[PDB]
Structure 1
Amino acid sequence: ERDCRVSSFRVKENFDKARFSGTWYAMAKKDPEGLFLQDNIVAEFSVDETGQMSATAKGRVRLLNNWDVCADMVGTFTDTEDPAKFKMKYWGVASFLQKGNDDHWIVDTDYDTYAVQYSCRLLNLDGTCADSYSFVFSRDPNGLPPEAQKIVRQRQEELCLARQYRLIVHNGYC
């Protein structure tokens, strides 16, 4: 019945940059087109004294040569007039790691258990997203409570990304 246009997706009301600080463990993922981080993904969100948020992401990526680098990614976030929607500039500490600029939307979080991020890299002419990625973060390395799980699938369906996530392995590779 409802809207898959990106312009219509609801995000986190009055997103608190500081309450989202710290370690988030990626539990689930919806991959974009091309090369992306595979597994072992752990982000560290941070806010300095002026309200600027940054993050570091750690994760394993398989490069064409068939490398298995544990990428150390850095992202800085630019605020928009929506508190839960950011522009994220990112780069690897290694030169070979992918650099870019993506939207970063906090679709929902309760700050202490779960987060849902989304990024549409490209919009179709109808307003829907032709290439997106999404992550489901957990405060706990062992996942989400049945409770958090129900809300998170609700949100996935809302993002028109239901049934398009795969679980993330964490086996200490990095």
Structure 2
Amino acid sequence: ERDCRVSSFRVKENFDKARFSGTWYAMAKKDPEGLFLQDNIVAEFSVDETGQMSATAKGRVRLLNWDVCADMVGTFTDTEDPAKFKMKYWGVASFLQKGNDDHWIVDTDYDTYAVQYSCRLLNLDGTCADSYSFVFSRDPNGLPPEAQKIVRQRQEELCLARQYRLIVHNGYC
């Protein structure tokens, strides 16, 4: 039986903030409870001179049967693992969803694909009770087959492979 304990999940060895910087298009998402980012999700990652990673995102978001284009902001606090962060986030608009989630770079090759994961709440057996995950691509037209195959493996390793939906980019925002 597969190990689905969050503590067991491998993440990106020697994660490199600088190489990860720039534009990432969300191709797929596994939603948490009370999902927020809906579609047209585009992220912009940056790293400052002190070495701190941060990001912005734009996308159609769920407010209520009410969705809207929103700009989000995230700042990442380092942990002992170079691929595991604490992400403080908020909307440019006061009323938008704000919070602090774990933010793991599960895998990336920096120039093609990235797999992100967050467990918001653990089960008592160490599995995740409430998770989300994004698959990003540098190219909004999607991953090449080699990357697609690696990503599928990573999705399976997170015990999430059956639970993603595709994210469309159709110029809405």
Describe the superposition over 1:56-82 as per-residue Cα deviations: whole angstroms up to 9, x where unpaired: 011101322x43321100000000000
Matches of 1:110 and 1:62, distance apart in 2 = 30
Listed as ranges, the gaps of 5+ residues in structure 1 are none
Matches of 1:96 and 1:67, distance apart in 2 = 14
TM-score normalised according to structure 1 size: 0.97
Deviation, 1:2, is 2.6
Listed as ranges, the gaps of 5+ residues in structure 2 are none
Matches of 1:69 and 1:2, distance apart in 2 = 39
Work out whether 1:39 is the aligned partner of 2:39.
Answer: yes
Describe the superposition over 1:87-112 as per-residue Cα deviations: whole angstroms up to 9, x where unpaired: 00000000110110000000000000
Q: Which runs of 4+ in 1 moved over 3 A?
A: none
* Residues 59 and 69, structure 2, Cα contact 8 Å, conserved in 1: yes
TM-score normalised according to structure 2 size: 0.98
3-state DSSP of counterpart to 1:38: strand
* Residues 119 and 132, structure 2, Cα contact 8 Å, conserved in 1: yes
Identical-pair percentage: 100
Deviation, 1:142, is 0.3
3-state DSSP of counterpart to 2:18: coil
Matches of 1:102 and 1:109, distance apart in 2 = 20
Deviation, 1:3, is 1.0
3-state DSSP of counterpart to 2:150: helix
Deviation, 1:7, is 0.5
- How many residue pairs were aligned? 173
* Residues 58 and 69, structure 2, Cα contact 8 Å, conserved in 1: yes
